[PDB]
Amino acid sequence: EVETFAFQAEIAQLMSLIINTFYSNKEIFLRELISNSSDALDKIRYESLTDPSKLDSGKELHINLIPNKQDRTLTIVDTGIGMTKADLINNLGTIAKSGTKAFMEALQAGADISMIGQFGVGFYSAYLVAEKVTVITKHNDDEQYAWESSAGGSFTVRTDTGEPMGRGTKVILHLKEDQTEYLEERRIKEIVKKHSQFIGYPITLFVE
Amino acid sequence: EVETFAFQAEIAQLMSLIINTFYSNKEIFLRELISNSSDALDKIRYESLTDPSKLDSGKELHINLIPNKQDRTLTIVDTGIGMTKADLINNLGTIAKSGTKAFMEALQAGADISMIGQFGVGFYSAYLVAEKVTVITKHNDDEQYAWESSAGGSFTVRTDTGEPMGRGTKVILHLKEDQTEYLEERRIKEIVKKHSQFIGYPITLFVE
Ligand SMILES: CCc1cc(-c2[nH]nc(C)c2-c2ccc3c(c2)OCCO3)c(O)cc1O
Numbered sequence: 001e002v003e004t005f006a007f008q009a010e011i012a013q014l015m016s017l018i019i020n021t022f023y024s025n026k027e028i029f030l031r032e033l034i035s036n037s038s039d040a041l042d043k044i045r046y047e048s049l050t051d052p053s054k055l056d057s058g059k060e061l062h063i064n065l066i067p068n069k070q071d072r073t074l075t076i077v078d079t080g081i082g083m084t085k086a087d088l089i090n091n092l093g094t095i096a097k098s099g100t101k102a103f104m105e106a107l108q109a110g111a112d113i114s115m116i117g118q119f120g121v122g123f124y125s126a127y128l129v130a131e132k133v134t135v136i137t138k139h140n141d142d143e144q145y146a147w148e149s150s151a152g153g154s155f156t157v158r159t160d161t162g163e164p165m166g167r168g169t170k171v172i173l174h175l176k177e178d179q180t181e182y183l184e185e186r187r188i189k190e191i192v193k194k195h196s197q198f199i200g201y202p203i204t205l206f207v208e
Numbered sequence: 209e210v211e212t213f214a215f216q217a218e219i220a221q222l223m224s225l226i227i228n229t230f231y232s233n234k235e236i237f238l239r240e241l242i243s244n245s246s247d248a249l250d251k252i253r254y255e256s257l258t259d260p261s262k263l264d265s266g267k268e269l270h271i272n273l274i275p276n277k278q279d280r281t282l283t284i285v286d287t288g289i290g291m292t293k294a295d296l297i298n299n300l301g302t303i304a305k306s307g308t309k310a311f312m313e314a315l316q317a318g319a320d321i322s323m324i325g326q327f328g329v330g331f332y333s334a335y336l337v338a339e340k341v342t343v344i345t346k347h348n349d350d351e352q353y354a355w356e357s358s359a360g361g362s363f364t365v366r367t368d369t370g371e372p373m374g375r376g377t378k379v380i381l382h383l384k385e386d387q388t389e390y391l392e393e394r395r396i397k398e399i400v401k402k403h404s405q406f407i408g409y410p411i412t413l414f415v416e
């Protein structure tokens with residue numbers, strides 16, 4: 001079973017600006033995703049302080065960067081708090097309607113696209129480099145869900161068959177044809193060091 | 209009634225490093241506090257999307273910067289989600305034990321003190337400029353509380369008498385004698401523009 005939803009008008013607009021604006025500094029997508037992972041990891045660490053049982057679905061709090069040159073996907077996995085079905089539908093837990101409006105007004109007054117994360121909508125920077133994004137997520141209070149979108153104004157949500165992840169969020173970037181540099185090991189390392197060097201959780205870059 | 213608590217050893221250590229390390233770029237305290245306010249504002253905006261009644265304690269989502277040269281205090285107020293008594297006691301809702309350890313290890317490997325916010329413990333950067341910090345907070349699910357500390361290994365929590373704030377968090381910096389520059393209007397504006405220029409919520413700098 002697959003449900004299909006329209007993005008709110010404001011998120012459709014944000015997505016179109018990211019996809020259609022000429023902007024060469026596309027590499028900032030990664031620190032935005034890493035920063036999202038870090039926030040979700042913070043959240044599970046804090047909840048676990050009063051209820052250790054929240055970590056029964058995995059004690060290790062970390063981030064994995066997984067390139068696959070065959071599928072042309074870059075995957076950012078964390079073992080953070082994950083998301084419920086309702087959070088996913090509700091702009092992946094972001095304040096995207098108000099965040100987008102504030103971001104637009106900022107762009108009018110001298111901001112640029114790399115400041116997107118300052119408005120709580122950094123997730124959508126994914127579309128700087130990816131033609132399609134799949135988000136798989138598992139919250140302690142819910143089943144595993146798969147969100148997906150190639151933009152165009154719509155996204156799907158379904159229950160995720162098979163591969164149970166325990167707890168956390170997985171962002172699979174199906175990369176644009178001309179953005180394959182972000183599957184190269186030295187490129188990913190360079191970007192982590194440039195933008196995400198000092199982070200509260202370990203980051204493992206998988207090799208192929 | 210006043211309760212007195214010991215900081216966990218790790219937070220006592222973080223606090224001592226901030227107070228005793230020679231580090232001239234003290235002005236970053238403000239963007240860390242503004243960034244905390246922004247996160248709390250994000251949180252109430254998101255909760256309000258499924259339950260509008262969460263905003264009955266105030267619809268306006270903003271940040272106020274209030275200097276007072278007579279009391280020598282700089283106060284950062286927001287109308288964010290606020291904090292419960294347990295959050296306050298639990299390192300003001302931060303992941304400060306793990307955050308501190310990660311921050312220390314980062315400092316050993318080329319980080320500096322301005323990266324403190326990357327470890328979820330930016331609040332304590334307050335002690336770069338303040339001899340005593342008072343935090344007043346009001347969550348929808350609780351009464352108004354006052355947290356306070358002049359470091360030295362301890363903090364107090366009490367119920368807050370009188371001045372009800374509706375909803376949010378108030379950080380009153382009782383500034384060190386030699387740090388009065390942060391009460392000057394042009395100094396505060398300069399710092400907001402340098403470090404907190406593009407933020408998802410309005411910031412009002414009160415005049416005297
Ligand atoms: C789809 C975007 C995304 C979300 C998460 C994530 N998992 N669990 C949570 C609560 C989050 C999350 C949600 C919203 C958000 C986040 C993180 O960063 C702060 C403000 O916006 C994540 O871990 C990675 C990620 O790329």
Ligand SMILES: CCc1cc(-c2[nH]nc(C)c2-c2ccc3c(c2)OCCO3)c(O)cc1O
Nearest residue numbers: 244245247248288289290300301302331377
């Ligand atoms: C005492 C530190 C502080 C806290 C808040 C605040 N109010 N409500 C909440 C949930 C928060 C908060 C708590 C922890 C935290 C915050 C924000 O920034 C992200 C991670 O660490 C705040 O609004 C301002 C502020 O200076």
